[PDB]
Design a protein around this motif. Structure first.
Motif, PDB file in Angstrom:
ATOM      1  N   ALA C  45       0.691  -1.034   0.202  1.00  0.00           N
ATOM      2  CA  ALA C  45      -0.097   0.143  -0.172  1.00  0.00           C
ATOM      3  C   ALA C  45       0.477   1.203   0.239  1.00  0.00           C
ATOM      4  O   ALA C  45       1.924   0.992   0.664  1.00  0.00           O
ATOM      5  N   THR C  46      -0.014   2.311  -0.837  1.00  0.00           N
ATOM      6  CA  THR C  46       1.770   3.703  -0.560  1.00  0.00           C
ATOM      7  C   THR C  46       0.316   4.478  -0.183  1.00  0.00           C
ATOM      8  O   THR C  46       0.451   5.455  -1.070  1.00  0.00           O
ATOM      9  N   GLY C  47      -0.905   4.510   0.112  1.00  0.00           N
ATOM     10  CA  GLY C  47      -1.382   5.323   1.147  1.00  0.00           C
ATOM     11  C   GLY C  47      -2.476   4.762   1.930  1.00  0.00           C
ATOM     12  O   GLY C  47      -2.300   3.655   1.809  1.00  0.00           O
ATOM     13  N   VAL C  48      -2.725   6.107   3.199  1.00  0.00           N
ATOM     14  CA  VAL C  48      -3.541   5.104   4.447  1.00  0.00           C
ATOM     15  C   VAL C  48      -5.397   4.455   3.760  1.00  0.00           C
ATOM     16  O   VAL C  48      -5.931   5.956   2.531  1.00  0.00           O
ATOM     17  N   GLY C  49      -5.523   3.594   3.589  1.00  0.00           N
ATOM     18  CA  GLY C  49      -7.098   3.727   3.130  1.00  0.00           C
ATOM     19  C   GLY C  49      -7.217   2.058   3.041  1.00  0.00           C
ATOM     20  O   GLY C  49      -6.587   1.323   3.152  1.00  0.00           O
ATOM     21  N   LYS C  50      -8.974   1.912   2.765  1.00  0.00           N
ATOM     22  CA  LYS C  50      -9.431   0.353   2.868  1.00  0.00           C
ATOM     23  C   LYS C  50      -9.149  -0.153   2.104  1.00  0.00           C
ATOM     24  O   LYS C  50      -9.547  -0.018   0.924  1.00  0.00           O
ATOM     25  N   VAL C  51      -8.571  -1.389   2.083  1.00  0.00           N
ATOM     26  CA  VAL C  51      -8.283  -2.058   1.027  1.00  0.00           C
ATOM     27  C   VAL C  51      -9.731  -2.932  -0.003  1.00  0.00           C
ATOM     28  O   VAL C  51     -10.873  -3.593   1.022  1.00  0.00           O
ATOM     29  N   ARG C  52     -10.047  -2.894  -1.277  1.00  0.00           N
ATOM     30  CA  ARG C  52     -11.290  -3.396  -1.717  1.00  0.00           C
ATOM     31  C   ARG C  52     -10.483  -4.025  -3.282  1.00  0.00           C
ATOM     32  O   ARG C  52      -9.297  -3.229  -3.995  1.00  0.00           O
ATOM     33  N   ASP C  79      -1.453  21.167  -4.551  1.00  0.00           N
ATOM     34  CA  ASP C  79      -3.107  21.305  -4.809  1.00  0.00           C
ATOM     35  C   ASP C  79      -3.549  20.462  -4.007  1.00  0.00           C
ATOM     36  O   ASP C  79      -3.400  20.149  -2.499  1.00  0.00           O
ATOM     37  N   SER C  80      -4.496  19.428  -4.025  1.00  0.00           N
ATOM     38  CA  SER C  80      -4.814  18.095  -3.601  1.00  0.00           C
ATOM     39  C   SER C  80      -3.853  17.423  -3.066  1.00  0.00           C
ATOM     40  O   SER C  80      -3.948  16.547  -2.248  1.00  0.00           O
ATOM     41  N   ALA C  81      -3.088  17.305  -4.216  1.00  0.00           N
ATOM     42  CA  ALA C  81      -1.734  16.211  -3.809  1.00  0.00           C
ATOM     43  C   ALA C  81      -1.357  16.874  -2.615  1.00  0.00           C
ATOM     44  O   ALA C  81      -0.927  15.408  -1.710  1.00  0.00           O
ATOM     45  N   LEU C  82      -0.965  17.848  -2.395  1.00  0.00           N
ATOM     46  CA  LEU C  82       0.178  18.111  -1.151  1.00  0.00           C
ATOM     47  C   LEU C  82      -0.361  17.671   0.140  1.00  0.00           C
ATOM     48  O   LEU C  82      -0.620  17.896   0.893  1.00  0.00           O
ATOM     49  N   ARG C  83      -2.585  18.740   0.007  1.00  0.00           N
ATOM     50  CA  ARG C  83      -3.330  18.301   0.962  1.00  0.00           C
ATOM     51  C   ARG C  83      -3.389  16.898   1.647  1.00  0.00           C
ATOM     52  O   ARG C  83      -3.128  16.965   2.332  1.00  0.00           O
ATOM     53  N   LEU C  84      -3.310  15.503   0.451  1.00  0.00           N
ATOM     54  CA  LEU C  84      -3.499  14.586   0.578  1.00  0.00           C
ATOM     55  C   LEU C  84      -2.026  14.193   1.716  1.00  0.00           C
ATOM     56  O   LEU C  84      -1.613  13.123   3.066  1.00  0.00           O
ATOM     57  N   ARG C  85      -0.727  14.875   0.768  1.00  0.00           N
ATOM     58  CA  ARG C  85       0.658  13.758   1.694  1.00  0.00           C
ATOM     59  C   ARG C  85       0.604  14.513   3.405  1.00  0.00           C
ATOM     60  O   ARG C  85       1.198  13.827   3.934  1.00  0.00           O
ATOM     61  N   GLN C  86       0.266  16.121   3.089  1.00  0.00           N
ATOM     62  CA  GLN C  86      -0.193  16.197   4.801  1.00  0.00           C
ATOM     63  C   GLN C  86      -0.947  15.968   5.434  1.00  0.00           C
ATOM     64  O   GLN C  86      -0.430  15.169   6.903  1.00  0.00           O
ATOM     65  N   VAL C  87      -1.836  15.426   5.116  1.00  0.00           N
ATOM     66  CA  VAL C  87      -2.848  14.715   6.184  1.00  0.00           C
ATOM     67  C   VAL C  87      -2.016  12.819   5.976  1.00  0.00           C
ATOM     68  O   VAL C  87      -2.772  12.807   7.598  1.00  0.00           O
ATOM     69  N   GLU C  88      -2.223  12.191   5.378  1.00  0.00           N
ATOM     70  CA  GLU C  88      -0.901  11.292   5.430  1.00  0.00           C
ATOM     71  C   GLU C  88      -0.012  11.129   6.573  1.00  0.00           C
ATOM     72  O   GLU C  88      -0.093  10.302   7.150  1.00  0.00           O
ATOM     73  N   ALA C  89       0.785  12.520   6.358  1.00  0.00           N
ATOM     74  CA  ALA C  89       2.181  12.407   7.446  1.00  0.00           C
ATOM     75  C   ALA C  89       0.699  12.972   8.929  1.00  0.00           C
ATOM     76  O   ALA C  89       2.133  11.845  10.121  1.00  0.00           O
ATOM     77  N   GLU C  90       0.551  12.839   8.838  1.00  0.00           N
ATOM     78  CA  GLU C  90      -0.346  13.898  11.036  1.00  0.00           C
ATOM     79  C   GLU C  90      -0.602  11.883  10.829  1.00  0.00           C
ATOM     80  O   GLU C  90      -0.886  11.731  11.863  1.00  0.00           O
TER      81      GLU C  90
END
Ligand SMILES: [Mg+2]
Ligand SMILES: [Mg+2]
Ligand SMILES: [Mg+2]
Ligand SMILES: [Mg+2]
Ligand SMILES: [Mg+2]
Ligand SMILES: [Mg+2]
Ligand SMILES: [Mg+2]
Ligand SMILES: [Mg+2]
Ligand SMILES: [Mg+2]
Ligand SMILES: [Mg+2]
Ligand SMILES: [Mg+2]
Ligand SMILES: [Mg+2]
Ligand SMILES: [Mg+2]
Ligand SMILES: [Mg+2]
Ligand SMILES: [Mg+2]
Ligand SMILES: [Mg+2]
Ligand SMILES: [Mg+2]
Ligand SMILES: [Mg+2]
Lengths: 136, 53, 133, 48, 48
Positions: C45-52, C79-90
């Motif tokens: 996985a390269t992101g926080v999320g549920k596996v589908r 834009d959205s990509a930077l915001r997702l990276r910040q949310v994932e980091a926290e």
RNA sequence: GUUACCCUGAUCAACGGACAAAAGCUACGCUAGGGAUAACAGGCUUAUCCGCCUUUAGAGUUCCUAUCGAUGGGCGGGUUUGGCACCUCGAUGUCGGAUCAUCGCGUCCUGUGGCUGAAGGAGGUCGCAAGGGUUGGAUUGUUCGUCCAUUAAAGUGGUACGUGAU
RNA sequence: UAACUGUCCUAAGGUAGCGAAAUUCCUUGACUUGUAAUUGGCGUCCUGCAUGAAUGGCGGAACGACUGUCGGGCUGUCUCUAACAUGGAAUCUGUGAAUUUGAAAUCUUCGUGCAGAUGCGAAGGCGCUGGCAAGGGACGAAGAGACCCUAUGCAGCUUCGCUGGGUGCUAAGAGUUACUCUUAUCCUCAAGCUUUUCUGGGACGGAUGCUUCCUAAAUAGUAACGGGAGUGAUCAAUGGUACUGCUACUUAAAUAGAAAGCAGUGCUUGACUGUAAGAACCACAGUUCGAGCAGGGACGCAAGUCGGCAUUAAUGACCCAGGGUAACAU
RNA sequence: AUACCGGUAGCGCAAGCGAAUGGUAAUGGAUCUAAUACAACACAUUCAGACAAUCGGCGGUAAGGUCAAUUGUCAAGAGGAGAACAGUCCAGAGGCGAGGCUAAGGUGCCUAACAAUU
RNA sequence: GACACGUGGCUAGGGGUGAAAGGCCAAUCAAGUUCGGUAAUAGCUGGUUUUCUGCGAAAUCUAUUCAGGUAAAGAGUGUGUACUAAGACCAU
RNA sequence: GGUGCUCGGUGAAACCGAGCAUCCAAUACUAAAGAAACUUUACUGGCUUAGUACUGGGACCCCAUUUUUAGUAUA
């Protein structure tokens, strides 16, 4: 009654107990008067040829003999003085798996009375029970 | 193995400071002196590396 | 030996970056969104999320594509990509603090030596001392 | 409290660090880097 | 998986869910500001 | 020279890789253990063995059943050869006969009944019956075996293939 | 039959005179005698498993508490034992041990059972206690070693096992100037050390890493000297990247692959430097995947890929030794 | 308010279909929890297992043979039944009682209990 | 007579002596006896001595000059910490 | 207004101008593949003296519902 192949391969299980009661290889497909087993028993090639000649003695030249079982399963038997272990023994004889509902000898329009007469001599030389089935 | 004549050999930098890469090579199928541009960390610029034993 | 090769995180399981979803021989399952694939076709996985796990049309037949769907409370804090990276980091930092709280200081997490700083390059963090001109 | 007829039952014949024959503690590299001086100095904080 | 050792996967799963819980609460509260099972009285016993 | 980094070098193949190197014998052997490992045999099994059948194709100058059993299928014994290692190594006579025994019958005789290709004799089976009888010795360490010649016959087995605190 | 010739590795293929013999598997060797009947001898014959002038071959007189056989005489060895003599034993008086010993008030049969029961179960038997006898049982007693296996086991012996100048000769220098000293080393003598393990006993044979398939029973995992294929690599392109044609192959097997197949091209070395959260796994050591960050690069208009090859084998720790570079030191 | 994973048993001429038990995650339990979970806190022991049932390899679809999987017992477990009985069935023994109810097993006599249904 | 006997003497242990047997050298000799190193060593065998109470395994797996030994993991006990759980069952 | 087969057009894209099959605007048979449903039974979980001691789940194939096609016919 011998494994007509190129490899002297080896087997693991020697059993055939499973029942096919519903329309599942239970009707005759090549002949009209059939001889079937009733219980599972692994039977050897010598018995198959001995029953085949024993019932063939009561069969005319205008009666085909559709055999249904072919001895293609190697059985490994160790010699007398060999200690238990050190690998699997040499292939001694060839056997067949028999299931409780399998027809193994089915006949053409040779008369049903003679077909029942041939069944008695077949069941005399065979280890497991035999039964009569006809096309009907 | 003993039948396989491929050996490990060293690639010494042209630049200086003796940084090197050790890579294997077939002698028979490659009688070149092996020369490739690889990264040299002492200078942090890519230079050439010839084969010496 | 043993060579254990199966699926580790099933569908609907919450995943975090780096977690191996399935280990296989050959691409029985194909990578989808927010999913990486390794040398031995390991799906990670390269992101926080549920596996589908979904089935899609494929070149040979019935391709199964494994994916990680990001959380619905994420993509709302992003834009959205930077915001997702910040949310994932926290979220990743919070996971470490919760894990350290649950393992109550009974495991050797950090070196803390009596030595001079563990060897540091200009980048730092090298367990290898290298002499400097 | 010793059990039945092992080598532990005989008493003082086997060291605690013997692990069967795999010398695992002898499989790690040896480092001879002496630390710098100032580790022999006394360290005093400005806070104290 | 042949290792006879307790897996840390239940701890890892619990950590992941507890980690995302503050984001879930904040975003659910933000949607609730910007924009399950019925239970009975606990009786001591059901035989008079 | 010291220390780090970048690297290299065993069929270290007994491949988690004995301390440098590196073969045997012991019916002259010694010690500590093991019935945790075998032999002398008791236990389990019955593949091989031995009886009982069944099918009985056929042979039998004809005719399957006077008499024999070819091929398959089984049931019983553990007295054959095997398989396991459960029992005794704080060591336990078996692979012989000399004397003396007891039991079973799958009866060699004596006592007897049926089928008989049954002239009664002389035979072949088959059915009952274990009371007591089964002798000589020349040759082999042989319990194996003959062949000398006499008897009604010169039985086969369980007996830790009976029996050295005789 | 193979006398003379034809061949192949080869120090050489065993003479007059030997042989089923102290020694020849077949074996009761065919042959004569020997006995009424002979597998153990005698004298021939040849088919020498595994004979033979210095391991001395060919026989002889005399000799032997040596070994195997034949006749005469002799007799209780025997057919087949009997009586008697002497001395024990048995009776009495006197003197007066030891082996053994968990406690015993210790029946039979069948069954059961650490698998052969005095002690358990079922049935039955038995007035009680002895002397004198016989020894089937008490796995009688007597030795914690008859044989087999094991040990970080010992001991002695042997050798083209290993290492040594210890020992004897030898070699080369040196001194008093035959003898002595120093150093070395063949062949002897005396030692000191080694001389694994798995094994339906041990020996023999076989094997000891890693990968795949069946066992393995639909997460994973799962044994047996259980059963079938591989491997201890290749490749400066068969690596990376961007493309071009065609379509049933790619390989050790499995999973997979419209390219990860088959033929090509254009540039290149990411077959890098320093790291890496998080997981698979897992006794530990190790092993496996890894997004992302920094450096400098490659290909591509870009999108973006590249920390060797579709993957799972080809990856031996540490110590020791050697090389390049860097810092400090002398 | 449930979702993914597996390619076996069975079936098919083959390609392929394909259970049941199963694993994993979420959610809900006033269901259980005189305890559980963890520990770089400390002290061990064990590392010779045996058999029975259900499914197997090698054996002879032999062996209280040997080696896998699941469950149980014994090991380390008495009591009752199986005549006797390591491993079978019921049942888990703190002690005393000349109290009662049952399990497995019984109900002609030994040997406790109905000519119950007879 | 390659004879027997008597009385002193000599050869002593990695040694003596042997018409040669692993024979003899003071009733245990292919290495005498005694003393010392020595309380040698033994992963082997045997043994371990008063009571009560509470809890309570394992004979799997990996490595090993190693498979009758040992060590790590699993399973035990005490102590600590911590959840209505890093727990057990059942339902969807 | 829809998909393709390709002629070209740029920007690497994708659409544009054509011109045929239906998507709509068909019925009637046949041979393939899939979908969901289901009688029976194998097969199994628990229990088990090994199934006239039981009980839960439940296939495959055939028949029957139907979809994607293709081929053969109609005026
Ligand atoms: Mg080794
Ligand atoms: Mg050595
Ligand atoms: Mg025996
Ligand atoms: Mg007298
Ligand atoms: Mg008895
Ligand atoms: Mg008397
Ligand atoms: Mg007496
Ligand atoms: Mg040893
Ligand atoms: Mg290698
Ligand atoms: Mg150096
Ligand atoms: Mg199948
Ligand atoms: Mg168990
Ligand atoms: Mg118990
Ligand atoms: Mg009990
Ligand atoms: Mg009882
Ligand atoms: Mg001495
Ligand atoms: Mg256990
Ligand atoms: Mg062990």
């Amino acid at each position: 009654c011998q494994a007509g192949q190129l490899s002297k391969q080896r087997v693991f299980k020697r059993e055939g107990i499973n029942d096919v009661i519903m329309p599942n290889t239970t009707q005759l497909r090549y002949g009209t008067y059939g001889i079937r087993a009733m219980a599972s028993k692994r039977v050897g090639a010598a018995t198959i040829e001995a029953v085949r000649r024993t019932l063939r003695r009561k069969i005319k030249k205008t009666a085909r003999l559709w055999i249904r079982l072919s001895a293609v399963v190697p059985v490994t038997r160790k010699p007398l003085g060999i200690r238990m272990g050190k690998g699997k023994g040499v292939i001694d004889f060839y056997a067949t798996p028999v299931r409780p509902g399998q027809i193994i000898f089915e006949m053409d329009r040779v008369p049903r009375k003679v077909a029942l007469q041939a069944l008695t001599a077949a069941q005399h030389k065979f280890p497991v029970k035999l039964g009569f089935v006809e096309w009907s | 193995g003993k039948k396989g004549v491929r050996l490990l050999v060293k690639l010494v930098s042209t630049a200086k400071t003796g940084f090197f890469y050790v890579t294997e090579k077939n002698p028979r199928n490659t009688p070149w002196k092996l020369k490739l541009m690889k990264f040299d960390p002492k200078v942090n610029k890519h230079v050439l590396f010839e084969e010496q034993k | 030996x043993x060579x254990x090769x199966x699926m580790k995180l099933t569908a609907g399981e919450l995943a975090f970056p780096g977690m191996i979803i399935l280990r296989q021989r050959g691409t029985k399952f194909h990578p989808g969104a927010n999913v990486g694939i390794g040398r031995d076709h390991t799906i990670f996985a390269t992101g926080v999320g549920k596996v589908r796990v979904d089935t899609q049309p494929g070149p040979r037949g019935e391709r199964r594509v494994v994916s990680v769907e990001p959380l619905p409370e994420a993509l709302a804090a992003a834009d959205s990509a930077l915001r997702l990276r910040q949310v994932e980091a926290e979220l990743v930092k919070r996971r470490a603090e919760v894990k350290r709280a649950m393992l109550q200081g009974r495991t050797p997490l950090e070196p803390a030596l009596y030595f001079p700083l563990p060897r540091t390059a200009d980048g730092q963090l090298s367990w290898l001392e290298r002499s400097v001109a | 409290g010793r059990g039945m007829k092992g080598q532990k039952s005989r008493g003082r014949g086997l060291h605690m660090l013997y692990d069967g024959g795999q010398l695992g503690l002898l499989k790690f590299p040896v480092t001879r880097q002496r630390p710098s001086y100032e580790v022999l100095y006394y360290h005093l904080g400005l806070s104290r | 998986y042949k290792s006879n050792k307790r897996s840390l996967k239940p701890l890892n799963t619990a950590a992941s869910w507890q980690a995302v819980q503050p984001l879930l609460a904040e975003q659910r509260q933000r949607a609730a500001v910007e924009g399950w099972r019925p239970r009975l009285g606990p009786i001591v016993d059901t035989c008079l």
